[PDB]
Amino acid sequence: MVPISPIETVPVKLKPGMDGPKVKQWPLTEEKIKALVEICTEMEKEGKISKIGPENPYNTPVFAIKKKDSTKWRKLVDFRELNKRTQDFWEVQLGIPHPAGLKKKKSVTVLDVGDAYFSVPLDEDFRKYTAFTIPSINNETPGIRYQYNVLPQGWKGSPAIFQSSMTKILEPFAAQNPDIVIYQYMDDLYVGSDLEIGQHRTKIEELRQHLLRWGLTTPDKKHQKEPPFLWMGYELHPDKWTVQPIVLPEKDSWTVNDIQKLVGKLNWASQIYPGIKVRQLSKLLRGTKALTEVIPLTEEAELELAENREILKEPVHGVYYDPSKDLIAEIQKQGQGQWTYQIYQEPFKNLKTGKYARMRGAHTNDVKQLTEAVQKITTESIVIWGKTPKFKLPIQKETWETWWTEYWQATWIPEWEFVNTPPLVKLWYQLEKEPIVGAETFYVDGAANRETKLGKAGYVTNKGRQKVVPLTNTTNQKTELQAIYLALQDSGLEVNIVTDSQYALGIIQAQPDKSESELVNQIIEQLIKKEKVYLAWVPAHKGIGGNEQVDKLVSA
Amino acid sequence: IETVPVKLKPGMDGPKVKQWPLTEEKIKALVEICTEMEKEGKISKIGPENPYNTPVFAIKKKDSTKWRKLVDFRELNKRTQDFWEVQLGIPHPAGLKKKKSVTVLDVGDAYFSVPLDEDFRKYTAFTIPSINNETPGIRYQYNVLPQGWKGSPAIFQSSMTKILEPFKKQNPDIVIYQYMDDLYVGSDLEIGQHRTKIEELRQHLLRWGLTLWMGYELHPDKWTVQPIVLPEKDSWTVNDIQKLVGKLNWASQIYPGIKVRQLSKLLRGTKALTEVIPLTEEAELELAENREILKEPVHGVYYDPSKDLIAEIQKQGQGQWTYQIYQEPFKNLKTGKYARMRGAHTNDVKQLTEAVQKITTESIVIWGKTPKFKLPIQKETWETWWTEYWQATWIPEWEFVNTPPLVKLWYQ
Numbered sequence A: 001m002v003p004i005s006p007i008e009t010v011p012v013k014l015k016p017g018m019d020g021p022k023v024k025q026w027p028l029t030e031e032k033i034k035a036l037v038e039i040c041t042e043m044e045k046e047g048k049i050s051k052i053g054p055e056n057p058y059n060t061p062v063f064a065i066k067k068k069d070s071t072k073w074r075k076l077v078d079f080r081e082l083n084k085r086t087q088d089f090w091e092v093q094l095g096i097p098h099p100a101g102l103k104k105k106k107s108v109t110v111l112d113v114g115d116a117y118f119s120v121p122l123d124e125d126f127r128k129y130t131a132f133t134i135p136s137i138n139n140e141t142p143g144i145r146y147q148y149n150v151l152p153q154g155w156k157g158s159p160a161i162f163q164s165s166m167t168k169i170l171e172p173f174a175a176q177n178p179d180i181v182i183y184q185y186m187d188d189l190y191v192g193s194d195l196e197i198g199q200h201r202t203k204i205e206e207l208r209q210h211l212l213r214w215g216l217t218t219p220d221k222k223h224q225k226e227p228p229f230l231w232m233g234y235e236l237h238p239d240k241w242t243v244q245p246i247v248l249p250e251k252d253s254w255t256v257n258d259i260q261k262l263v264g265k266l267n268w269a270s271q272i273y274p275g276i277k278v279r280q281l282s283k284l285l286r287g288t289k290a291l292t293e294v295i296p297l298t299e300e301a302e303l304e305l306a307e308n309r310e311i312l313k314e315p316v317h318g319v320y321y322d323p324s325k326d327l328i329a330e331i332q333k334q335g336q337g338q339w340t341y342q343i344y345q346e347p348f349k350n351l352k353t354g355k356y357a358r359m360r361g362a363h364t365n366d367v368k369q370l371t372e373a374v375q376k377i378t379t380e381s382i383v384i385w386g387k388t389p390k391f392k393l394p395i396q397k398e399t400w401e402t403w404w405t406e407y408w409q410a411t412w413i414p415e416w417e418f419v420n421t422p423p424l425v426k427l428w429y430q431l432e433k434e435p436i437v438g439a440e441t442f443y444v445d446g447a448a449n450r451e452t453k454l455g456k457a458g459y460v461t462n463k464g465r466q467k468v469v470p471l472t473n474t475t476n477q478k479t480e481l482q483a484i485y486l487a488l489q490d491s492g493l494e495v496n497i498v499t500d501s502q503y504a505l506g507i508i509q510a511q512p513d514k515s516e517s518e519l520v521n522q523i524i525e526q527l528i529k530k531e532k533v534y535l536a537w538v539p540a541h542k543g544i545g546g547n548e549q550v551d552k553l554v555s556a
Numbered sequence B: 001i002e003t004v005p006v007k008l009k010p011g012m013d014g015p016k017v018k019q020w021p022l023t024e025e026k027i028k029a030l031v032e033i034c035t036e037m038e039k040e041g042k043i044s045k046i047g048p049e050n051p052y053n054t055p056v057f058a059i060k061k062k063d064s065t066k067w068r069k070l071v072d073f074r075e076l077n078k079r080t081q082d083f084w085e086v087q088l089g090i091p092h093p094a095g096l097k098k099k100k101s102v103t104v105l106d107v108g109d110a111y112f113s114v115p116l117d118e119d120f121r122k123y124t125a126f127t128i129p130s131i132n133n134e135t136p137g138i139r140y141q142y143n144v145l146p147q148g149w150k151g152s153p154a155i156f157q158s159s160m161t162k163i164l165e166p167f168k169k170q171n172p173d174i175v176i177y178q179y180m181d182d183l184y185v186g187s188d189l190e191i192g193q194h195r196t197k198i199e200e201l202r203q204h205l206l207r208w209g210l211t212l213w214m215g216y217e218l219h220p221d222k223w224t225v226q227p228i229v230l231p232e233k234d235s236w237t238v239n240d241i242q243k244l245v246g247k248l249n250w251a252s253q254i255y256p257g258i259k260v261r262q263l264s265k266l267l268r269g270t271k272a273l274t275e276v277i278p279l280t281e282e283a284e285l286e287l288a289e290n291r292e293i294l295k296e297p298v299h300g301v302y303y304d305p306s307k308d309l310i311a312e313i314q315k316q317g318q319g320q321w322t323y324q325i326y327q328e329p330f331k332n333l334k335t336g337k338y339a340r341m342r343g344a345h346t347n348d349v350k351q352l353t354e355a356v357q358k359i360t361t362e363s364i365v366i367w368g369k370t371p372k373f374k375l376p377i378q379k380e381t382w383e384t385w386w387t388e389y390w391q392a393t394w395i396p397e398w399e400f401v402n403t404p405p406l407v408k409l410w411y412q
């Protein structure tokens, strides 16, 4: 017999200050007891489990689920109470490899090692907590006691200990076979190479023997897959990849369910199908919190799904990654705070696509949203390909330059170039840095009564122009804004505006181009029509005759 | 050559911070660096029974072309024991901030000769990430004292004094301070002469490596705190006086007797913003008294080592950045301005990142600890890019300012 190398044992402890599990074995029917002793007898003589004495006070319940179709019985141990008591393990499970990150390899094989997790030895000091009891027939003898000698399934540490052990074993094979690549995700082993199919299956054969050296049995006669394959909702083909073909549900009164199974499924399509939009269907969700409530479709929804039942019509595919070519990311504004993007290396052939939705914000503008989307694509690209893409953006170089040089915040987007595909991102207004000579000076103010919620807003100018408007159901902050709106509405193309509203300054200095407030949006629309606006701030209640002779006018 | 016993504070688990994604070249650099560190015994691979994690990345330090590993031990430093057993850390030398020149010497490589408590090693776990979650992450833990850990200087402190006991024996004029992996050496000495005593220490540090090659030249005394300035003009517009009154009203929160009655009376009436107004004699007087008020420092401005230091930064444009360090609002302990010769004419985030590093350096010199920053930048932009221009081995804390403060005008 060719001798087996022992797999190193990972030391395991329970959580600090926690005993072991002591759960009672549930009453099983007589036929199910018969199956369990059959199963445990073979695995005991396989070295996988072993009978324990009456010493071990720990117990985990065991069930047997007759499998469907197959007239077989398979065993089930519910390790929920033991999992609660076992230490936390390291989390490599952070991400799922994205198909667009895989490099194109000529030959690729995948081998399921859902077998091998059970040939890995379990820490001896920890096997005492794996104990379980086969309940005897008529409960007239003591239930036969068992414990695990190897990684049990459904146990917390099994996936992490199995993959750690497997990585240890794969290291020297990969290191001494640089002409291959071996990825390892979940229960599968991905092996790819650029050599002819002949020398590939030989190196596949060599790997299986390498794993025999540690006592890990590998699928052989077929049973190991070759592309294509259906994997994690994708379709991986030798030259291309795509979402699994997955077709929209149909209802007349759409539930919560109905679109929770659809935006989450339209999100899936957006990673390869360009231009998928989701907003007019997600507003129908965050404003609700009942997992059966029904919502009628809004007027802009059946217009949007009519385009989601329009991009999902022809199969579009993604290419695999070529590390020798440049990475390009291109972004398009879609409207209503929606952004769509495509990442590619050659024209017409995307590696992947995607979307970005504005942050919930009180105010916003296009440049900040484009900047945010650039950062999202930057991080996504680092994850998938290990580098930042070169950007093509619907914003002019001089527009960006004026923006970042005058924006009060620090901002930066990596190397990029203008792509002239409307709608273009624009600066819709720009305040002046100095007062305007020969422009009328509007001293504005507003005030409201906290009790009656009545208020006034208006202005006085240097030419003697004046206005005060009475207002109902308004606040001090609203009247301060309304005062500015009136001055903008009533002035020429160039105007100086003096206010004491730190609230208004804070809004306008943030330079929004669209707002939740219908009032701020009117102000924005007036700013866009102007030629020059200089906005000055003065402290209130200093009697600065503008913000005095109009403070004594709006509170009268 | 034996362990110093090190614990966390009770009720606190080790750090479990997720590793952020890294470019391919940074991963490659970390693999090469960690492979050699593993060969030299400084670190060792670990298994999945270690649930702790601390982020790591790689950069290039000032004036050098070789990648260096930096571990973001910020979370672990919060969770680490406070080292005041027999000697409560290292009392801050108040004399370091008043020296004519101070130079910063990286002494961090000396930590890699002193083992770390075998019980504590599990808390220094970090992960070299893989691209696209293809391979699992390569996990290491430290066997030696790690750079960036706050325990490393505290543990090396006793064994560092013997290293300098000859030097400060010869040179009682020189103040040497250690923060993290940095040695701060100051003197009231002439400039060319101050450089000479310095590599005298550098050669003095190689002698004890038998049993770190460049220098950053700070000048604390050649710098000072900053007063509030008011314009000196012969003709004032409405706008000019309005801005003046606003600045004075803002400064009246810091200085008590600031008055604006006589100047604001000039602003009565709705005049054009660009119209010139002669200054009332009472207004000219009021402006004069406000000036002398602004020439004295703020009274009762005290440093409290029990409270955090807060640093605010404002982007002023054209490569200029203002900042203030304070503990209580309206009670600045230092203010300053950082402009060009930064290398970031077209990169706002590189300038800000360099401004953060310099303010932290100044803060280490003056008080011996780092401030909490209020950064004028969106969280998403900062967290994406700051590691691209970071060069220091320490990292401060920071929050983000989303509303444009009016005070940018007043510090301009």
Ligand SMILES: NC[C@H](NC(=O)c1ccc(-c2ccc(C(F)(F)F)c(F)c2)[nH]1)c1nc(CO)cs1
Residues within 6 Å of the ligand: A097, A102, A110, A111, A112, A183, A184, A185, A186, A188, A189, A190, A219, A223, A224, A225, A229, A230, A231, B133, B134
């Ligand atoms: N769950 C089903 C199980 N696996 C698969 O079919 C499968 C097909 C393709 C991948 C795959 C793709 C990519 C990666 C990586 F992340 F590396 F890119 C990876 F790790 C794995 N896995 C199998 N069962 C049998 C029957 O014995 C055979 S395969």
